[PDB]
Design a protein around this ligand. Structure first.
Ligand SMILES: CC1=C(/C=C/C(C)=C/C=C/C(C)=C/CO)C(C)(C)CCC1
Length: 135
């Protein structure tokens, strides 16, 4: 059953993000800036169609996709690499593979109550982010 992500979700915690960005070959200044920044996720869900807006004062990162489709994702801000990205529905878990340069590149996102729980992977290394629903 595909879970309803429609809303504005504010960050509670950010765990292992400097090690995830070091696994993408990112500079030390952008690792310290992006681990100090707490973004707001605005998600608009329409069945398989999804707009995920990761909102911040330094850079806003918007992912627009249909679940099912392998799309051209430029990760502009993070590392600036083009991945062939396929996102699939496992009921509660929204499960993604990013096809390109890195070993086991992807992400898994799910709802626990009012909390969005995100795992992001690059070269095995998993960053864990928690966001609470407010509007
Ligand atoms: C570089 C960078 C950032 C990294 C954003 C990332 C890594 C977003 C990932 C979003 C996902 C995985 C969406 C699909 O569920 C943010 C905007 C925080 C702060 C400014 C610099």
């Amino acid at each position: 059953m595909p879970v309803d992500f429609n809303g504005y979700w504010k960050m509670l915690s950010n765990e292992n993000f400097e090690e995830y960005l070091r696994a993408l070959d990112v500079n030390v200044a952008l690792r310290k800036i992006a681990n100090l920044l707490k973004p707001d996720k605005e998600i608009v869900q329409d069945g398989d169609h999804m707009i995920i807006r990761t909102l911040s004062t330094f850079r806003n990162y918007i992912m627009d996709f249909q679940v099912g489709k392998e799309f051209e994702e430029d990760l502009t801000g993070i590392d600036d690499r083009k991945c062939m990205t396929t996102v699939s529905w496992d009921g509660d878990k929204l499960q993604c593979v990013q096809k390109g340069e890195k070993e086991g590149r992807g992400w898994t996102q799910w709802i626990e109550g009012d909390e969005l729980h995100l795992e992001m992977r690059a070269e095995g290394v998993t960053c864990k982010q928690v966001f609470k629903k407010v509007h």
